[PDB]
Design a protein around this ligand. Structure first.
Ligand code: MG
Ligand code: MG
Ligand code: MG
Ligand code: MG
Ligand code: MG
Ligand code: MG
Ligand code: MG
Ligand code: MG
Ligand code: MG
Ligand code: MG
Ligand code: MG
Ligand code: MG
Ligand code: MG
Ligand code: MG
Ligand code: MG
Ligand code: MG
Ligand code: MG
Ligand code: MG
Ligand code: MG
Ligand code: MG
Ligand code: MG
Ligand code: MG
Ligand code: MG
Ligand code: MG
Ligand code: MG
Ligand code: MG
Ligand code: MG
Ligand code: MG
Ligand code: MG
Ligand code: MG
Ligand code: MG
Ligand code: MG
Ligand code: MG
Ligand code: MG
Ligand code: MG
Ligand code: MG
Ligand code: MG
Ligand code: MG
Ligand code: MG
Ligand code: MG
Ligand code: MG
Ligand code: MG
Ligand code: MG
Ligand code: MG
Ligand code: MG
Lengths: 201, 117, 64, 144, 27
RNA sequence: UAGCGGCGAGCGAACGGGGAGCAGCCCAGAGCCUGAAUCAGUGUGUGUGUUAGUGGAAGCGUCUGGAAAGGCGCGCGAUACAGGGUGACAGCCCCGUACACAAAAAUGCACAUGCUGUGAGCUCGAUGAGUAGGGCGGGACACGUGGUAUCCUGUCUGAAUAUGGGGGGACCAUCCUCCAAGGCUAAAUACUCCUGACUGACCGAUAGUGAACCAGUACCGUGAGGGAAAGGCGAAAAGAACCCCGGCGAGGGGAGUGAAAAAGAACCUGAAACCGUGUACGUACAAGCAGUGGGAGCACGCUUAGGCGUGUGACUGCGUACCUUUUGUAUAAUGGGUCAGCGACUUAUAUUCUGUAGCAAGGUUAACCGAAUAGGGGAGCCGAAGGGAAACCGAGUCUUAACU
């Protein structure tokens, strides 16, 4: 599998099972849903009839009066009563198999190749940590909405990309499918390609 | 979350309350009565789409029987005449001719009498 | 939580290869001098659980 | 391929029942529960094996047998598991290193299931007749 | 104006004034 | 699971394995060398926090509009496009944010060190008696007295003491292992009255704390105790000078403010039930779920008059509400005065089945590590072999002396 490079106009040999796999949409949708469910914080609660501040006394007697039977003012049919099925703080994280997560990433990197949304450069650095320099470089690359994955820790690049919301900068380890989809272009260092190919066989 | 249902229940009640215009009293004002009255009106409308076809055929037959007895033949002799003369005119058209064109109804009666004779 | 096994049914039934349950026959525990030997001989071997009562067994024995 | 172009497989996600939300849903006022029973009650239902008050099957029938502690520390081994070890010798400590039988196991038989091709020395284990023939045919040497 | 105590517990019936208007004929 | 159990309902381990975390010591006693380790206390010093704070970038024009932060142009900042406010939606108006710093004084925590106290090490010993155990009665151990080990003890008793004793699930023998009847000990663990920062597929005033508002208040009760309701003018009060009717009223009409007073304080938007005024049509010889089908006439709009609409509805055919419960209800069986708002098959973990997706005779990890939805971790679990009560045998096995 060969990836032509943008700047030096060379080639780069990759695994076809990694970067030319057919797009398994149901797998990718399962992984993207499980990622967005893993982001979900799940901090809420309501009060049941047990947890409402009140008293456990019958508001009136059972019979004799003309009113309906009632046993508790905490009843979920009263105003300021309990919630019938009041919620608890719950964990919405799903299990994703390891081979399904890698099948999805190998699927969407094959799709970004087929959609030409993947750009390969040898190096992508900014000299000084300035967002003006980074915006100039991306304007020269004709890029606005981009993910920049780099196999190293570049602090000046992280700082120069921290203020731009169109731009996100990751390590090659810290890549995710929802970002690889949510961004319009993806720029990979050739080393980051070598690392992604190594993790993903 | 916590779906608040004021907009939906208002538009759902107003769909019924618009259908209940013209009704007496709370049948046009109160949803519990109007919905109970709209359903009965749909039942009657389903029924009377069938009864319209009965009542007009009955009206047509009574008008043909009158105009035929005016020309001196009964209805039951006149339909049997038109069957034996093969005239396949339905009795809507026979009631219309019996009203507006009495000459053509007389000619149909004479055709039926000659078909029986 | 885990389901708890009905321990009497776990002492009374064993799952076979195709998923059926074997069991011992009744009527072979006492009062045995008036019973025919043919009857007892047809009561010693284990029998399979019938199709009708196999659902209550599976409900009582979820862990096979 | 965007986040607003993904869609799951057909028949993957099924909607799920919502009881008590109208006539047209089918699951109307009662919700699959019938009328005026014990089963229709909230929390209602009888426990496992309850046949009415009739003596249930798990008490009509007698208990039998006991539980062998030695059966818990015995194991059976396929012939296909013999290649998964290293060194071409098969012991208990070799099988436990290969994560086949487990630590607490003290006895093992080798059974004709699957097939072996490489010559494998079997040491300190029982062997069936067909596994003895297949090992000796593949070049093995069963010893203790 | 601070006009509660209208239908609070309806003591109206907490009075539970003796009923059974001498009608134990329905036995 | 093993077991316990009117062997019922149910209760429910351990050995062992993977991890987090890891730390060992002293007195039952004398000496010898004597202050030697460590700890405690108290000072000082240094560092780091905390308890006030400081600086903190960069925009103009035009159009609409009451008002520009909006639209359209043209620029600029960014280690700061977190957030909030400003007359409509502001990276560049403001407060801030990133970052950079800052404490006279008090105090925490680290080290270091001073002082006070503390003893360190070596040798030879000693080795926790009304105790262990037992009988009776109870309790705890998953173990309900059972064949019941082990632990505790109310009562009565009662050893040996290192050549000795305890345990290894009745018990004995052998073997293994350990040394009771004296103590101390960090971490990993549990919780949040309270403080700070941040977050939310949590609520948005019948919700959310009972309480967004002077709420545990008003109020009730002898008392313990119970326990509410009630948010929003406008950008800014500019909160209506003055005039008039009226009781030197209430209330209203002007005028005035304002973008707006159908924003006027009983003040955003202002639905419905309910009650009115006006207009059109119908109605005082006419009997009933009040409609539906037909349908004259009347009024009003459009139109190329074509006739359609709209409202009403004389007369006329048919026609005894809804729900629930029932063999069966117009039923004179239940329930509902009406409107508006709320109000009932959920959640967690196991398990089975179907669908779907991944890998496939293999599939998959949990804890935890990790900066971290990755990767590691294969402890384990299910499956590929079963039969038999079991030992055991094994594509066979069990039964039986043996199976046609
Ligand atoms: Mg009480
Ligand atoms: Mg509440
Ligand atoms: Mg993982
Ligand atoms: Mg109306
Ligand atoms: Mg017997
Ligand atoms: Mg019912
Ligand atoms: Mg019934
Ligand atoms: Mg039933
Ligand atoms: Mg209940
Ligand atoms: Mg009985
Ligand atoms: Mg293992
Ligand atoms: Mg400042
Ligand atoms: Mg500033
Ligand atoms: Mg401002
Ligand atoms: Mg506005
Ligand atoms: Mg001792
Ligand atoms: Mg004792
Ligand atoms: Mg004893
Ligand atoms: Mg005792
Ligand atoms: Mg004693
Ligand atoms: Mg003891
Ligand atoms: Mg023993
Ligand atoms: Mg001790
Ligand atoms: Mg409230
Ligand atoms: Mg409101
Ligand atoms: Mg309240
Ligand atoms: Mg008082
Ligand atoms: Mg006034
Ligand atoms: Mg406003
Ligand atoms: Mg208003
Ligand atoms: Mg109104
Ligand atoms: Mg009239
Ligand atoms: Mg009249
Ligand atoms: Mg009348
Ligand atoms: Mg009509
Ligand atoms: Mg009812
Ligand atoms: Mg029925
Ligand atoms: Mg009845
Ligand atoms: Mg009837
Ligand atoms: Mg009546
Ligand atoms: Mg009734
Ligand atoms: Mg009744
Ligand atoms: Mg009623
Ligand atoms: Mg399920
Ligand atoms: Mg499935």
């Amino acid at each position: 599998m060969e990836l032509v490079l943008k700047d030096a106009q060379s080639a780069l040999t990759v695994s076809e099972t990694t970067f030319g796999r057919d797009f398994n949409e149901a797998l990718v949708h399962q992984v993207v849903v499980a990622y967005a469910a893993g982001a979900r914080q799940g901090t809420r609660a309501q009060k049941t009839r047990a947890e409402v501040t009140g008293s456990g006394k019958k508001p009136w007697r059972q019979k004799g009066t003309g009113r309906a039977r009632s046993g508790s003012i905490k009843s979920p049919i009263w105003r300021s009563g309990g919630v019938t099925f009041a919620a608890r703080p719950q964990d919405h994280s799903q299990k994703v198999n390891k081979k399904m997560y890698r099948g999805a990433l190998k699927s969407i990197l094959s799709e970004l190749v087929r959609q030409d949304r993947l750009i390969v450069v040898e190096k992508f650095s900014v000299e000084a940590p300035k967002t003006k320099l980074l915006a100039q470089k991306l304007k020269d690359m004709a890029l606005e909405d981009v993910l920049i994955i780099t196999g190293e820790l570049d602090e000046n690049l992280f700082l120069a990309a921290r203020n731009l919301h169109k731009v996100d900068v990751r390590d090659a380890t810290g890549i995710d499918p929802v970002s690889l989809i949510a961004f319009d272009k993806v720029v990979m260092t050739a080393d980051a390609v070598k690392q992604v190919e190594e993790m993903l066989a | 979350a916590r779906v608040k249902r004021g907009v939906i229940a208002r538009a759902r009640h107003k769909k019924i309350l618009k259908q209940a215009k013209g009704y007496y009293g709370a049948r046009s004002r109160v949803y519990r009565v109007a919905f109970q009255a709209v359903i009965k009106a749909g039942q009657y409308a389903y029924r009377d789409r069938r009864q319209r076809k009965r009542q007009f055929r009955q009206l047509w037959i009574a008008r043909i029987n009158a105009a035929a007895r005016q020309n001196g033949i009964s209805y039951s002799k006149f339909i049997n005449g038109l069957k034996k003369a093969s005239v396949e005119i339905d009795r809507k058209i026979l009631a219309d001719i019996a009203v507006f064109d009495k000459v053509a109804f007389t000619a149909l009666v004479e055709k039926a009498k000659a078909a029986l004779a | 939580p885990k389901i708890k096994t009905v321990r009497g049914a776990a002492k009374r039934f064993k799952k076979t290869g195709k998923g059926g349950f074997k069991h011992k026959h009744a009527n072979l525990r006492h009062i045995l001098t008036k019973k025919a030997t043919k009857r007892k001989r047809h009561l010693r071997p284990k029998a399979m659980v019938s199709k009708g009562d196999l659902g209550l067994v599976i409900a009582c024995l979820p862990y096979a | 391929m965007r986040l607003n172009t993904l869609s799951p497989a057909e028949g993957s996600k099924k909607a799920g029942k919502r009881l008590g939300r109208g006539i047209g849903s089918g699951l109307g006022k009662t919700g699959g529960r019938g009328h005026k029973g014990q089963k229709s009650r909230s929390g209602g239902g009888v426990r496992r094996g309850f046949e009415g008050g009739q003596m249930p099957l798990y008490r009509r029938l007698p208990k039998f047998g006991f539980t062998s502690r030695k059966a818990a520390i015995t194991a059976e081994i396929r012939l296909s598991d013999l290649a998964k070890v290293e060194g071409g010798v098969v012991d208990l400590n070799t099988l436990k290193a290969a994560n086949i039988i487990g630590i607490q196991i003290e006895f093992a038989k080798v059974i004709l299931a699957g097939e072996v091709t490489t010559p494998v020395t079997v040491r300190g284990l029982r062997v069936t007749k067909g596994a003895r023939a297949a090992i000796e045919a593949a070049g093995g040497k069963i010893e203790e | 104006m601070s006009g509660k105590m209208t239908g609070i517990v309806k003591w109206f019936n907490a009075d539970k004034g003796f009923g059974f208007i001498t009608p134990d004929d329905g036995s």
